[PDB]
């Protein structure tokens with residue numbers, strides 16, 4: 001039996017949580033109650049299989065079981081086509097209601113009146129809005145979410161204790177989702193081979209002292225864990241994630257010094273911990289890379305006898321000595337290395353042909369460096385809000401066909417690079433910036449994939465996982481774009497508009513700015529400020545009031 005094996009390892013609590021998440025991700029539109037029913041049914045059925053390893057239907061596969069239940073065009077089919085159906089029907093932007101939170105004491109009352117149905121509610125909502133959310137990590141946020149309500153609903157003030165914590169979680173939860181969406185995207189659209197180079201390059205940075213073989217073993221287990229979680233096999237994903245966490249801590253000494261504090265904590269915590277660990281200290285005198293990848297006379301021989309192992313060696317060796325290069329950059333270097341060998345090892349005298357492969361890197365290393373230097377200087381010179389606005393105008397012209405809400409969302413997140421990275425030293429800026437930029441653009445890419453409207457976004461998105469950022473950066477203002485005429489329905493007055501927060505106000509104003517740019521693409525930074533300021537003054541006066549709606553009329 002498979003259901004039992006899992007129930008035993010994950011324990012009932014997690015098992016119920018994971019199954020609930022699994023369904024909420026497969027059916028983002030079904031009510032909360034209905035899902036619980038399906039869970040409990042599945043949960044009981046497994047307990048029998050825990051007692052009777054030979055009971056009825058315990059020989060099934062998690063997919064068939066979960067499949068059948070969810071079925072009480074996709075269902076009219078069978079395993080595995082039937083599963084690939086639900087996976088293929090996951091929505092990255094469901095038409096689901098805005099997730100607002102009632103009055104503090106309101107939530108607090110229900111957190112007590114029923115603590116379980118409260119958490120399942122959380123997991124339910126989060127899973128359904130982020131159909132790819134890393135299940136194991138969700139269990140982490142769930143416990144931290146719980147901790148909040150148990151400590152904050154029992155204090156002098158609550159909306160000063162709780163809320164602040166509910167803010168940080170939503171944010172951290174939004175980054176975790178985006179971060180995991182890129183991993184799923186990498187596996188699916190580009191294959192695991194692509195994901196393996198990625199994890200190899202990154203773990204080698206985190207763990208410079210680990211010998212290549214250890215990094216391989218970790219990349220392997222890691223690829224398995226993420227494949228499962230991205231494929232909807234949550235129960236096994238969690239189980240495998242825990243085994244991996246256990247392996248890491250045991251061999252901790254041959255991996256990284258930073259794992260010490262991580263390893264001493266409860267399962268959920270140390271897994272999250274291991275995932276966020278700082279790079280270990282890099283070893284001192286490491287032989288020059290050239291010696292074995294350029295000067296050696298067996299380069300071409302090793303490339304043929306074992307390309308996969310050799311290129312891996314290359315990535316591993318280059319990454320471990322470059323914690324200052326973004327993962328995507330190291331992959332571009334890896335790729336150039338491969339291209340230069342593929343051609344060189346056929347020509348007359350290979351050694352001469354690829355003797356200058358490092359020279360071809362310089363160009364690829366500086367392009368990222370400069371861009372990061374410029375927008376950090378710009379950042380300081382404008383502040384986050386002003387900074388996002390400049391990106392907003394820049395990107396709106398590159399891809400004017402993209403819908404307003406998306407452009408605002410994406411631009412804002414691209415704008416956060418500035419505050420999130422620039423406060424770091426050059427040495428740590430590029431990996432922070434470029435790897436973060438890659439996550440945001442994946443958002444653009446996945447949202448855009450639903451209802452495509454720009455072949456320029458499509459090309460940059462599907463052409464190469466590694467060049468996306470440079471691809472978007474290179475884009476010139478789209479001239480084939482025809483000015484979007486004035487609607488006005490966009491600015492229909494609404495009472496809320498006058499009692500908004502700073503966050504809210506900036507968002508409307510950025511929405512207004514995109515519409516402005518989509519309307520007059522040939523505008524100047526100067527005349528855009530003019531139209532904005534006047535319109536900002538207009539809304540400010542009309543909010544002064546009297547018969548407001550008459551004012552905005």
Ligand SMILES: N[C@@H](Cc1cc(I)c(Oc2cc(I)c(O)c(I)c2)c(I)c1)C(=O)O
Nearest residue numbers: 179199202206222244245271274275276277
């Ligand atoms: N900035 C990147 C770099 C990074 C990627 C991976 I791949 C990784 O290996 C794990 C191991 C476990 I265990 C997890 O639960 C997860 I998620 C990732 C680690 I460490 C760091 C990121 O954090 O995505």
Ligand SMILES: N[C@@H](Cc1cc(I)c(Oc2cc(I)c(O)c(I)c2)c(I)c1)C(=O)O
Nearest residue numbers: 371374375378390391394414437472473474
């Ligand atoms: N006034 C500067 C010009 C400049 C404007 C922007 I807006 C900017 O920000 C981005 C961020 C990303 I991410 C991109 O892909 C691109 I293209 C531009 C940067 I850096 C520089 C000068 O003349 O030096």
Ligand SMILES: N[C@@H](Cc1cc(I)c(Oc2cc(I)c(O)c(I)c2)c(I)c1)C(=O)O
Nearest residue numbers: 490491492493494508509511512535536539
């Ligand atoms: N139609 C929306 C409400 C809405 C009204 C206005 I008037 C508006 O336009 C601006 C322009 C600037 I410039 C501002 O600083 C601000 I605040 C609002 C926007 I965007 C939205 C609804 O019904 O939901």
Ligand SMILES: N[C@@H](Cc1cc(I)c(Oc2cc(I)c(O)c(I)c2)c(I)c1)C(=O)O
Nearest residue numbers: 486487512513514515516517519531532535
């Ligand atoms: N008389 C014009 C109509 C017109 C109305 C507005 I109100 C306006 O100003 C803004 C300000 C912002 I801020 C926007 O995002 C947008 I779209 C338009 C402009 I320019 C033109 C005609 O019919 O030709």
